[PDB]
Amino acid sequence: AESSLRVISKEKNSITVEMINYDNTLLRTLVEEILKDDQVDEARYYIKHPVIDNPQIYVRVKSGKPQSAIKRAVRKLSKLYEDLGTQFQKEFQRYESDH
Amino acid sequence: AESSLRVISKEKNSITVEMINYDNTLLRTLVEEILKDDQVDEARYYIKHPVIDNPQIYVRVKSGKPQSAIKRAVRKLSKLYEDLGTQFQKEFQRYESDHMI
Amino acid sequence: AESSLRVISKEKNSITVEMINYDNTLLRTLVEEILKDDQVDEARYYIKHPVIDNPQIYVRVKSGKPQSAIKRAVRKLSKLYEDLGTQFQKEFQRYESDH
Amino acid sequence: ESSLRVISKEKNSITVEMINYDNTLLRTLVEEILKDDQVDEARYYIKHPVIDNPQIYVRVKSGKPQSAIKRAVRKLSKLYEDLGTQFQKEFQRYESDH
Numbered sequence: 001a002e003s004s005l006r007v008i009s010k011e012k013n014s015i016t017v018e019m020i021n022y023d024n025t026l027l028r029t030l031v032e033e034i035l036k037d038d039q040v041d042e043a044r045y046y047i048k049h050p051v052i053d054n055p056q057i058y059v060r061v062k063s064g065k066p067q068s069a070i071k072r073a074v075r076k077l078s079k080l081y082e083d084l085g086t087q088f089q090k091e092f093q094r095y096e097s098d099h
Numbered sequence: 100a101e102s103s104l105r106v107i108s109k110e111k112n113s114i115t116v117e118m119i120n121y122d123n124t125l126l127r128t129l130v131e132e133i134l135k136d137d138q139v140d141e142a143r144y145y146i147k148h149p150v151i152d153n154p155q156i157y158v159r160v161k162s163g164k165p166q167s168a169i170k171r172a173v174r175k176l177s178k179l180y181e182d183l184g185t186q187f188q189k190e191f192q193r194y195e196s197d198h199m200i
Numbered sequence: 201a202e203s204s205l206r207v208i209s210k211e212k213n214s215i216t217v218e219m220i221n222y223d224n225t226l227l228r229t230l231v232e233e234i235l236k237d238d239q240v241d242e243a244r245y246y247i248k249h250p251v252i253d254n255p256q257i258y259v260r261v262k263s264g265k266p267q268s269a270i271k272r273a274v275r276k277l278s279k280l281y282e283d284l285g286t287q288f289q290k291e292f293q294r295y296e297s298d299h
Numbered sequence: 300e301s302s303l304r305v306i307s308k309e310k311n312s313i314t315v316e317m318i319n320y321d322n323t324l325l326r327t328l329v330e331e332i333l334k335d336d337q338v339d340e341a342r343y344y345i346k347h348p349v350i351d352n353p354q355i356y357v358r359v360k361s362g363k364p365q366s367a368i369k370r371a372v373r374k375l376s377k378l379y380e381d382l383g384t385q386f387q388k389e390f391q392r393y394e395s396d397h
Contacts, residue, residue: 005186007194017190025131026179029124067191074184080125081177087104088173091116092166094306095106098298101352103302103318107294119302120319153300205385207393217389225330226378229323267390274383280324281376287303288372291315292365295305 014060015067016046027055033073039063106166107155112140114165119153126154132172138162208256213241215266220254227255233273239263305365306354311339313364314356325353331371337361 001021009016019027027045034043041062045055059066100120108115118126126144133142140159145151158165201221208216219227227245234243241262245255259266300319307314317325325343332341340358344350357364 003182003186005190006200007190008199010194017187022183023179025128026183029128030183032124067187067195070187071184071191074180074187078177078180078184080122081173081180083102084125084129085170085173085177087102088166088169091104091106092170094304095109095298098295099109101318103304105294105302105304119300203381203385205389207389210393217386222382223378225327226382229327230382232323267386267394270386271383271390274379274386278376278379278383281372281379283301284324284328285369285372285376287301288365288368291303291305292369295308299308 008056010066013041013062013066014058015070016056016058017070018054018056019045020054027057029077030073031057033077034059034069037069037072040069043069109165112161112165113157113159114169115155115157116169117153117155121154123154126156128176129169129172130156132176133158133168136168136171139168142168210266213262213266214258214260215270216246216256216258217270218254218256219245222255227257229277230273231257233277234259234269237269237272240269243269308364311360311364312356312358313368314354315368316352316354318352320353322353325355327375328368328371329355331375332357332367335367335370338367341367 003022004020005022006018006020007015008018031043031045034040039061040059042058042060045057047053047055057070059069061069102118102120104119105117106114107117123146126146130142130144133139138160140161141157142159143157144154145157146154156169158168160168203219203221205220205222206218208218210216231243231245234240239262240259242258242260245257247253247255257270259269261269302318304316304318305313306316322345325345329341329343332338337359338357339360340356342356343353344356345353355368357367359367
């Protein structure tokens with residue numbers, strides 16, 4: 001049971017993707033990040049069977065494509081932790097250099 | 100609004116880092132991740148308690164170096180979000196062209 | 201000679217103060233800081249004789265007293281450099297502690 | 300919130316990374332440090348060269364470079380505090396006898 005995902009539906013300016021075997025915290029952070037986007041009208045999860053099924057993310061946008069709002073968010077999150085890694089590595093280098 | 104961090108205390112198997120201008124969600128996620136590490140004794144964030152100028156995180160390890168426990172967690176988190184994007188982008192492309200599982 | 205200052209006039213929502221023997225960098229920063237205030241309609245200097253006289257600051261406000269806008273700016277600026285001193289002091293003692 | 304960090308320190312010199320300050324503050328700081336007769340060089344780097352965050356560099360003829368920075372910061376704190384003293388007094392004086 002690796003993590004996986006699958007588009008379930010795509011309409012007008014909205015998309016729904018089933019998120020399989022993902023961390024709850026990861027999923028909450030994903031939607032929180034999408035909600036920071038001015039171009040997003042809604043982003044939330046839905047589920048048919050809360051304790052049995054995998055959650056599905058639904059994203060609707062006011063401008064552009066929904067897939068892109070997801071991409072913008074994921075890219076921001078990846079970059080934040082990549083940058084965090086650079087910041088820690090440099091600070092640890094400096095602190096140890098000092099000591 | 101650029102973020103920054105600074106090691107502000109270092110003892111035997113522990114370290115404290117001041118974290119400035121980060122999203123609170125980042126700090127809690129980071130600590131949640133470090134707590135999954137079997138070499139970690141304690142990991143805490145301090146954001147609203149006690150009264151401090153800027154958030155701090157504190158990590159104490161059973162083994163290895165505390166700065167290493169932080170690094171392991173950051174690198175795991177980077178991979179999680181990177182892999183998430185690899186899975187999405189592949190799926191969007193797959194679906195946009197044609198070829199439901 | 202000492203720096204000094206004198207109210208020249210005041211009305212309803214405006215004040216004019218003659219600034220004497222102040223460094224022009226200080227005076228520029230003062231007006232820049234006042235201009236950051238959303239309750240300020242105008243803040244600038246005037247002078248009768250550009251190379252002979254001392255500059256006069258004029259401040260007009262939308263709401264409140266004009267003296268208050270000046271106070272708020274000066275207190276921000278004082279606090280900024282006080283805080284900078286604390287930051288440098290702590291950083292220098294950490295850096296040398298490490299070394 | 301702003302922050303700073305010493306990132307290099309040589310015999311008579313220091314470099315400090317300065318994060319989320321107003322550029323006016325860095326320029327004012329450097330202008331003040333250059334007034335000090337113990338200072339050999341004082342520079343800010345904001346727009347040039349390409350760096351992630353601004354840096355200041357100070358080299359002294361004598362004393363310690365971190366002392367030159369301290370002297371300037373304390374002088375600046377005093378300048379703005381004294382400006383406030385002079386104002387507030389004057390407003391109170393004026394609102395009284397007008």
